[PDB]
């Protein structure tokens, strides 16, 4: 076999993290083989004993990988033979690399997803708890990156938290389909020894078992779904990062990241470069790239198994490692950044209340169009008088519309502004309080899984 | 405004299919404005009556679009004003194009996914039912596009059906999240007039309402996951297409597509080009392209609303139409194609039973490796005698292993070969029958989801 | 035969813009057929005459598409036989839809690329001219969206013009490979009539002719690389858009877009939303999506022709139209935006000069590390005294290093700062002037080559 | 600084292959710094001497990376100080990791592209030599994976070599824009010491120098282009792989890969799995993913430098190694595969000559449509008689059309079939010979 090919087929450099799941797969199959009469009870106890030793060797970090090992599967097999001899060979009876490999990857992903979920719920909790605490802070809401209308800082934080919860929800749906046992599919047509797949399922703790052997061997839906979930999660993180990066500019001056998540220069110690957010933003492309690669790998392949499917591992390991690191950095960032309440408030300008002025008339019965026209005239009048709209006198306003009463002075207050949004999902305090409670409830339910 | 700029902001060219859901959204909002005391009952009646006439105008295809109409939303309000005058203007009180547009897209998508669900289930049902009927057919199973081991044709059909049921399940999940009311989120901070959102949900028939206004206005998760579901579904269809394209070659000779789903030449009337399968395969790229575009459009955008989000509609419409056509063509192809039981059985060779010969020894207590070696010797001895392994004598067999008895004759039978796989998911008849039943129940449960 | 199938094969709805190039390909082929003797010198005159009439019909929007016309070709074929009778049938002799279609697309792409080229070079020229005019404007140069060091506003504009000139260079390279005649490749094995491909090349104005019939029929390299060129150009435009969108925020306050390329509400007359820039940014994803789709369509297809290749037209047309519109809008944006020199200069702070304070020491022979430390100490001493570094007394500076002399005052000047960068391509005035010259020269070379 | 943060910011784990180019960049800069009066002649000698020793340490795989080393640049910096002391610190005067990093990546890519060019040209040459020698072989040409019309096996092999020759042309275009010196761009605004960039260009052997410092520092066009070229090249190898996989099925029986590039079972010793071709086919997705990631990384980023740009390296390294391995495996596969002339031969059937029968009439003045209808009648007839088209008697033929003369027999010959395509680019032997000469001339020029 060609040396370059042999090099392209090696995966020991990156698949060793499958050590433990590979062993659990073999212990379960060994027990199954014993039930099918392929192994005697004595042979079983010997194999299970050996496999257990191997497990403690990897766990203790004393397992020794040898140059001949082309992949984790061969490394474990060699080691089993070294410990117990020929008897070890009976372990492959009726089993194929085809069903043993997807079994290891799914078990690995299930464990990986549980860890990812934890870090994800922690990020969501951090935003929600921070929103509750800073619920009185108010700043500009933006559209087209232009100041549109006053909003509570907590409404901004919660919008990200809510998107992240849908990610957490997709994570749970993906895990459900991953939690299906493919072992017992053999190489293509099924397991030829009437192996007890229910025993395998129970032993490995999957929720159910695969419906069709050909599908179970060749489908990589679980890889794609995971990569899709990962990519959308990264899109959300890239948006939050873009926001924070812009809000942390000296021009905006709304917040500052902690030294732990930013870099600087002794020459300009006052300026902090948002490295952590740029890292997070850049990973969206890295993760999207993996999703794109696997989709093209799978596109147009014929049934059943084909070597092309081997590209799955590196893509999954990369995304798992990337998400684990970025979610934690994100939590650290949100948890430790410092907001400048002063600057957020100073960014609120009277010009941003002209819509509320029109809304003031709408509530008194003035038709939408009129109310808008009256507010336009107020803005123009302030202009000509050289002042801002919150400074026009009652007489100035009455000159535009009799509908303006002295209470219109309540319009010119940023708390009264955000407090008009009591309709569900709005930025009024009660609405924000309601979201925090809905999110805490959602997190509980997703934690219970 | 700049003429090229104007053209770039025009969606009227393709967004007219939203005319109906736009009107319904407006009717619901009109009613909520009345409850909020923004409209009188008299005003509500006049607005609703006008919206109804516009709906009819679109329906009867008599609506007249004016060169001044930038988009469907502008066309409808223009027409409503023409019909009922000044009063039409109050309808937009507290509403934004921002929450109005996402509302129309989700309403459109919900109706669209309902139709796609129906075609997807019909495709799965066609695969499952043909599999029950052709359950006795046996043909080669392939790995690396090389004959591996005998399998039932139905096992092959069912592998695709199973994959498509997961697609169906994903569709169900996407639909749940699309079925959430975004109306009443206003331009960014929410609806400013204490609008009754529960009422909006009731009128528009959504299952729940959006939790956060900024999110509801800026997220396009629903477009992305619909495109993800669509792309994975296309991968499955592209694989089934590739299989069928190869099996329809004169070289394999396994099946032939009907005339309705293929093309031919009057110079070679016996040959058929699998056009339908090629189009289906090609749509995987087309659909994937939309998924890729929307992910890039969304990446790095700041909160909250930005014009970039307008790229959503064309991608959704293209994929909705692509899946609808593709799923129906796939159903027709699977339904009408003709298999050659003769060519499929013919492809089954004795060499394909060497594995079964090893398993024969395994079951008689011979260790895995020794059994494999034993079968290899037999394969080799047959090669030397210029005969197929099923022609070796019992005595020749015993010379390789005393574990070979006269019943080894049972190994050289393709029905017996496939019948070995009785473990759940296998190709044995009882396993296939169990799959058919499981899928029938799954389709029942999924069809009930709606 | 199937209804859904036929709809999927219909392209007349979008491929009509290929009307004229299809007729040109036909005229050139007719002529070659006469030379080969397939058409008498008389039939030729009648076929060419019938073609010029069809050309005229489309040219006047007079043409009428029948409900039976599945594509532009079939429409032109129907119209010719319908104009000159049976004779129009001899035109397909030896020709195939396979080599006829790629010929039409390449001709179309060649004309479209010359147009894109003009709009692209115009954008580049606009950036360069504006750089020449506003060469005295200085503002902060950013990294990590944090102020790093002073730069000339012109250096920023030229950084974008330089990237675009590479796109222009790539465009020319793509045009060269598109400028190769595929006609005469037949359906797969070539043309069976020994047609004069040199005549076809000369008549249709291609630079050379395709080397292999199978490759010419099956490759879509030209589509892929046109789309790659377009995606990278869009990446460049998405970056310029992002910068300008940020610079136009009220927070930065560096520039304002003209009314033609932005939108605003009467309620906040001073607010301008950068619509043009957002649309441009959003097209990066739309274009990337097309590239993504064609790559996926081509992946794993076997030789030679397959119906999958039909997805090429829609991806090309969308990107051709997108680029033509986007490039012109970008030109208008750059040409008409208004900068605030005052706000740009006011953003320059003394803290941005500590690096220059270190360089001051380095030029007096102090090692890099010691100079950096001394500047860091001065920065810190100022911080503790609650003053800016340009306000530290010489005595204070000498307490940090005796090497700081009275002439250190010159360090705290922003013109002096940008003027240190005389090395080729830096921001000093002479360097920026040199860049303008090289660009002017590059644009002339590319205009002259196009 | 946060530990997960530190791990993410660290590139040392993978950027070490830039060790030698990083050193070359430093040697060139050191030289220009001496000319600029920043370094004395002795300091220069000491710095160049230390840099050479470091080059040797890496070449001998004896270099010691320390826990504190964040990247290759910091590692070499640390090592030089260890070897020559305080003066090592003068080397970074006016330089930034921003212009240093792109200089190293371009130098590395320039070298990697020369290696890829070598393997790509060898693949093309291998296809061409094989097409020259198996020039008499004829088999079906396919459309929709259905037998369409006879063609020479060489025409098939050459269709792949032609597309690859365009990949080779693109590679040259990408290499030219990469061969532009970015060093001396500083961190953003340029080099602040009037460094002699022409001297840096000459020492590092670049063809020219970057035009604008901000562009030079922030653009990764060269990465995208390389990725675009690599992806299209993989598309091409993707198709070739798909073709060979199908042709290697027992159903087609056209060829069989050698043991070195396939796998098999002792249980079925006569069947070979073309895993070399499947590996090649799957790498298209691997490479496309890298292109997609970098495009997404760059989209929407503002000027000038941003940390996001650090994703460029791993994508480039993966694609360089993938292409290098895949190109050589493809060369071996084409060079060592065994074709079955007999089976390609048997694959040719009379049914595939009906279009030819129609052209035969066409060359006799009979109109396009009528000649077609005519061949169709000959086909229908032979069908009713249960015979192949080439068995029909001249009277059976004439009864359909008087234009059929005994010379119509020459039509039912597959060599005569492929010989009709003499027009440039066709499958006739003369055209195949011409293509072979044209490609050899192209490679000669692309090589020089």
UniProtKB/Swiss-Prot annotation, chains B, C:
Mutation effect (residue 265 to D): Loss of activity
Variant or mutagenesis effect after changing residue 220 to Q: Loss of activity
Enzyme class: lyase
Domain of life of the source: Eukaryota
Tissues in which the protein is found: Eye lens.
Effect on the protein upon substituting residue 15 to N: 99% decrease in catalytic efficiency
SUPFAM superfamilies to which the protein is assigned, alphabetical: L-aspartase-like
Keywords: Amino-acid biosynthesis, Arginine biosynthesis, Eye lens protein, Lyase
Substitution effect: residue 99 to E: 58% decrease in catalytic efficiency
Keyword Lyase appears in the UniProt entry: yes
Pathway: Amino-acid biosynthesis; L-arginine biosynthesis; L-arginine from L-ornithine and carbamoyl phosphate: step 3/3
Subunit structure: Homotetramer.
PANTHER family for the chain: ARGININOSUCCINATE LYASE
The protein's role, per its UniProt record: Delta crystallin, the principal crystallin in embryonic lens, is found only in birds and reptiles. This protein also functions as an enzymatically active argininosuccinate lyase.
Miscellaneous: Each of the four substrate-binding sites present in the homotetrameric assembly are shared between three of the four subunits.
Listed name of the protein: Argininosuccinate lyase
Native source organism of the sequence: Anas platyrhynchos
